């Protein structure tokens, strides 16, 4: 038996408050907090990593999406909770290099204790969350219908539709499907 199976989102509860977080941003070394990303419209939190085919599948769109919506007032934050001792590619130093290479326009924070991933009940990479002006969860799941194995072009449609609804004062579409990807690399149970 080689490798590990992919896992799906755990579907964080709609309406639940975004859990707190105070983590170092590898791009500039600043400690960034939830309060620092609270938005007047929406806050998008993304759990990702550097060596996962499901993340590689969406990396380009993450940048396109953030560039389209950050100017509209939407906040974006990427968090890497993978144990860097098991997966060196997820070390803060490597995270910094990746952010520079891909030109991530949003903070890339490292959650070394994994307490933030557990609080958001993040399960895979990538795992997407959207919270409203009051930091209540209004969307969680996939980026869009595309997957590494289906041929559908990447569009970011699911998140784009949710953000548009939030910016226009309309309810986020009800249909919310789980994301799928590599399991977050948890440290041994303590």
Describe how the helices and strands are arranged.
Layout: E1 7-8, E2 22-25, E3 31-33, H1 34-37, E4 42-47, H2 53-69, E5 75-80, H3 92-102, E6 108-110, H4 115-119, E7 124-125, E8 127-132, E9 137-141, H5 157-168, E10 180-183
Parallel strand pairs: 4-5, 5-6
Antiparallel strand pairs: 1-10, 2-3, 2-6, 4-8, 7-10, 8-9
Summarize the structure.
With 190 residues, the protein is an alpha+beta fold.
In CATH terms, what is the fold-level topology? Glutaredoxin
Oligomer state of the chains in this structure: monomer
Number of DSSP-assigned strands: 10
N- and C-termini, Cα separation:
26 Å
Domain Thioredoxin: 12-168
Pfam family, one: AhpC-TSA
InterPro entries: AhpC/TSA (IPR000866), PRX-like1 (IPR047262), Thioredoxin-like_sf (IPR036249), Thioredoxin_domain (IPR013766)
GO molecular function: antioxidant activity; oxidoreductase activity
Walk me through what this model shows.
With 190 residues, the protein is of the alpha+beta class. It has a single domain, classed as Glutaredoxin (3-Layer(aba) Sandwich), CATH 3.40.30.10. The chain contains 5 helices and 10 strands; from the N terminus they run E-E-E-H-E-H-E-H-E-H-E-E-E-H-E. Strands 3-2-6-5-4-8-9 form a 7-stranded mixed beta sheet.
